[PDB]
Ligand binder design. Structure first.
Ligand SMILES: Nc1ncnc2c1ncn2[C@@H]1O[C@H](COP(=O)(O)OP(=O)(O)O)[C@@H](O)[C@H]1O
Lengths: 286, 429, 136
């Protein structure tokens, strides 16, 4: 979508090549190099670098086999997903030391859940993916104890303790309840009642915010709570919130200006910015 | 609790739906509450539970139709949390909502004008209401006020409009209003309004038609159903006011034995009222049953009436000159109820109903055909004829015969088309 | 846009589940007085599979009725879409609006009825005093 075929008068001069997604062998090699570099931080797991990488590649394969663009437009899959997978695993492993294979596979499964499961729509797809992750973990790691995969919460949060560590659902629920008490005590006077889904979403939003990424796009029905949770998480992590209040006579030069304002408040000043906006703000493809 | 749940679900969810859909949803909710044994008052009417008589008379004096759907919509406009969005092909709702808030100096505006912003904050400062027309081109600048965000700080209420910051004056209400019944709103704007629908459908027009014919032909049944409607809250309020008058009289006269006569009359008067109310309660079901039968007696005509009117509207398809409005059919019905030469001395209720039906068909056909092309007259007749066939009893629907006559003749049966006899031709065969 | 749909991480904030609606109803209707000791326990009416008590009491019955109302609205929208069309989307903000209206209307009705009852009691006491005066 949004692509126009080039004129034959211009295509005559320019040769073109088709750069397809790297094949299974290329993917295995490229991310095996990354895994072998990453796992050198803790020498206790070096010999498990080769299967883990393969597991990732294997998972990606069926994660590319189903979720075609016909089913849903956002069901796309590229090596960028594997890159974010490796980067997230490395980010979690960076401050922590002396980890057994238990923690490695636990965080591998957690990253798989956050990258290949939260984008899905219908429940059968979600349970299919969860079954796929646990089966693949058993296939390339049958020697491991079934103590990490069956863990149904499998949620991490650095809010408790001092680093990115697995946390029980109930204690995190109590902590986030206290923090949200403090939250709507200060602005957003409307009460916020927390179910399971909002807890999952605040954890995911915080995980995306913490990493040095560039965006976090939310897909869902109106009033479901995307914006309020975005603001709440921004309040947790000390993220300033910028809302562009568009109108009928709004011009793209204004969008360039406030983009530059966000960029200067984020880069020239180390203040971390969470700039939130919706469809009513977008008018043209510019 | 159950009655409250039903009323709230109606005034919050049962918007944008026609009268039949609202009734169906209410029936489903009440059936579920019965399944859950939640004590909700049987056969409650939401028209008077959410507003007593006084508001109804004020709305009627405020240029509002007596339609049941219109009364429910007025209730929705009176009790709303999210700012309403009025949908009405006619201007009755807009005129009603102007006339209702003349004291609060309601202002008119629209999205298309360039001064919508200016009168918007001008209404925002003095707590002035703002009705905005032509909602199809929605202004995103209305998002902060629809979400009712309050940036209260320093003991005062504030709001952000674009780069400007304004003081949110209380007693400020905004009523969104549209003209086109066929428009698809984005879900973001849909979630922020309580849809109030004034569009006339088959069920709403049938209800209006039945109410009018009941009021005209049998005023006694109309009085009985109005009495049933008032019996929930209005009679109790009147009895309470009479009791308060009794109390003030008693404490003013200190119960003097010389004043006893003036007390006694009042007392017995009150008893009579109570007795009357009690009698009404003791006959409620019976009265209800009677009304039902009368409705079941007048149900066909109303349905036919509805059908007829919609046929008239659909007549715009054949020719561009056949545009007809609800006012025309309402005039036709008013003529066929009151100004009838055939109803000068008729007294039998069933005979009056038959005469009304026949003369309605006749007058409708005549008035439509006076402004119709000659080649179409017969067409219209058949349509009314078909309606009559649907309205009559003791006759088969003839659905298969009519489907064959209209569209069933064009089916694939060319195979085995024998010439048959010399009289038959190939097309005849 | 496949490019934007790949350049970031996508999260499907789907519609509120039945458990979410039930919890929202329970927390937003807590201040209300809905304790009926003599509430008989019906059969059937499943809406929330994880009913907090196996035999539901009045409060859980009411919140179950509220979530059932929301699901019936969803089903009515789906049915109207199937037969023809012309349906507006139903969102959890509608559920919040429904709960807020129900709470406010219950408070108003209960306050009015209690005021009428207290007026009745005041009248009873005053008329007893007048009866004593008449006896004297
Ligand atoms: N978990 C929740 N509990 C209570 N209310 C919620 C919850 N999530 C969302 N809301 C309500 O939704 C309303 C608006 O949500 P919003 O962030 O605008 O949703 P969206 O991002 O879909 O537009 C808020 O007023 C808030 O009260």
């Amino acid at each position: 979508p949004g692509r126009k075929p080039l004129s034959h008068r211009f295509l005559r001069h320019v040769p073109v090549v088709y750069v397809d997604y790297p094949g299974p062998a290329s993917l295995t090699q490229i991310y095996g190099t990354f895994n072998r570099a990453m796992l050198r931080l803790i020498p206790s797991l070096r010999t498990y670098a080769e299967p883990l990488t393969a597991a990732m590649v294997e998972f990606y394969t069926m994660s590319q086999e189903r979720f075609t663009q016909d089913t849903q437009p956002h069901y796309i899959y590229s090596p960028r997903e594997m890159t974010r997978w490796v980067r997230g695993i490395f980010e979690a492993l960076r401050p922590l030391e002396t980890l057994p294979v238990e923690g490695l596979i636990r965080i591998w499964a957690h990253e798989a859940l956050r990258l290949f499961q939260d984008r899905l729509v219908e429940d059968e797809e979600r349970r299919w993916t969860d079954e796929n992750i646990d089966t693949v973990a058993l296939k390339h790691f049958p020697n491991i104890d079934r103590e990490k995969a069956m863990s149904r919460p499998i949620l991490y949060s650095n809010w408790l303790s001092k680093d990115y560590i697995p946390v029980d659902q109930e204690e995190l629920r109590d902590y986030v309840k206290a923090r949200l008490k403090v939250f709507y005590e200060e602005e957003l006077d409307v009460p916020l009642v927390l179910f399971n889904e909002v807890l999952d979403h605040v954890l995911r939003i915080d995980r995306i915010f913490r990493q040095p990424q560039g965006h976090l796009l939310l897909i869902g029905v109106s009033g479901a709570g995307k914006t309020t949770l975005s603001r709440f998480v921004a309040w947790m992590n000390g993220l300033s919130v910028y809302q562009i209040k568009v109108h009928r006579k709004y011009t793209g030069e204004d969008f360039d200006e406030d983009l530059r304002t966000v960029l200067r408040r984020s880069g020239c000043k180390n203040e971390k910015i969470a700039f939130i906006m919706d469809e009513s703000n977008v008018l043209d493809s510019g | 609790a159950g009655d409250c749940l039903l009323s709230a679900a109606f005034i919050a969810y049962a918007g944008y739906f026609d009268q039949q859909m609202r009734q169906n949803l209410f029936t489903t909710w009440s059936h579920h509450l019965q399944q859950a044994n939640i004590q909700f008052r049987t056969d409650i009417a939401r028209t008077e539970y959410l507003s007593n008589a006084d508001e109804r008379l004020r709305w009627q004096a405020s240029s509002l139709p007596a339609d049941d759907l219109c009364t429910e919509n007025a209730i929705m406009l009176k009790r709303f949390n999210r700012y309403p969005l009025i949908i009405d092909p006619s201007g009755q709702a807009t005129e009603f909502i102007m006339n209702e808030y003349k004291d609060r100096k309601i202002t008119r505006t629209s999205f298309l004008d360039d001064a919508f912003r200016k009168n918007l904050e001008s209404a925002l400062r003095f707590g002035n209401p703002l009705l905005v027309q032509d909602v199809e081109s929605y202004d995103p600048v209305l998002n902060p006020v629809l979400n009712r965000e309050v940036r209260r700080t320093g003991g005062r209420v504030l709001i952000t409009l674009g780069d400007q910051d304004i003081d949110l004056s209380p007693s400020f209400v905004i009523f969104l209003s549209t003209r086109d019944p066929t428009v698809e709103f984005p879900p973001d704007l849909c979630s922020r309004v309580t849809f109030v629908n004034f569009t006339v459908t088959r069920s709403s027009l049938q209800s209006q038609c039945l109410n009018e014919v009941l009021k005209a032909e049998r005023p006694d049944v109309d009085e009985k159903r109005s009495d049933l409607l008032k019996l929930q809250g209005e009679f109790q309020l009147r009895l309470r006011q009479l009791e308060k008058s009794l109390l003030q009289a008693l404490n003013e006269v200190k119960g003097r034995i010389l004043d006893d006569d003036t007390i006694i009359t009042t007392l017995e008067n009150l008893k009579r009222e109570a007795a009357e109310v009690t009698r009404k309660v003791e006959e409620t079901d019976i009265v209800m049953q009677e009304v039902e039968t009368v409705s079941q007696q007048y149900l066909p005509l109303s349905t036919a009436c509805s059908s007829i009117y919609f046929t008239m509207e659909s007549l715009k398809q054949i020719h561009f000159l056949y545009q007809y409005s609800l006012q025309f059919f309402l005039d036709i019905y008013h003529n066929v109820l009151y100004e009838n030469p055939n109803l000068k001395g008729v007294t039998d209720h069933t005979q009056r109903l038959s005469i009304i039906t026949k003369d309605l068909f006749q007058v409708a056909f005549n008035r439509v055909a006076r402004g119709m092309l000659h080649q179409d007259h017969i067409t219209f007749a058949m349509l009314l004829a078909r309606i009559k066939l649907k309205g009559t009893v003791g006759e088969p629907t003839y659905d298969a015969e009519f489907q064959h006559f209209l569209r069933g003749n064009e089916i694939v049966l060319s195979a085995g088309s024998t010439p048959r006899i010399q009289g038959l031709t190939v097309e005849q065969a | 846009s496949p490019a934007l749909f790949n350049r970031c991480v996508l999260n499907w904030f789907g519609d509120w589940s039945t458990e979410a609606l039930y919890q929202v109803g329970k927390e937003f209707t807590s201040k209300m007085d809905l304790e009926k000791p003599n509430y008989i326990v019906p059969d059937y009416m499943p809406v929330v599979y994880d009913k907090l008590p196996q035999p539901p009491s009045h409060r859980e019955a009411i919140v179950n009725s509220c979530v059932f109302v929301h699901q019936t609205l969803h089903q009515a929208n789906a049915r109207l879409a199937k037969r023809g069309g012309r349906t507006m989307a139903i969102t959890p903000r509608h559920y919040l609006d429904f709960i807020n209206h129900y709470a406010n209307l219950f408070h108003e009705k209960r306050s009015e009825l209690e005021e009428q009852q207290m007026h009745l009691n005041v009248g009873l006491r005053k008329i007893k005093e007048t009866v004593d005066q008449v006896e004297e």
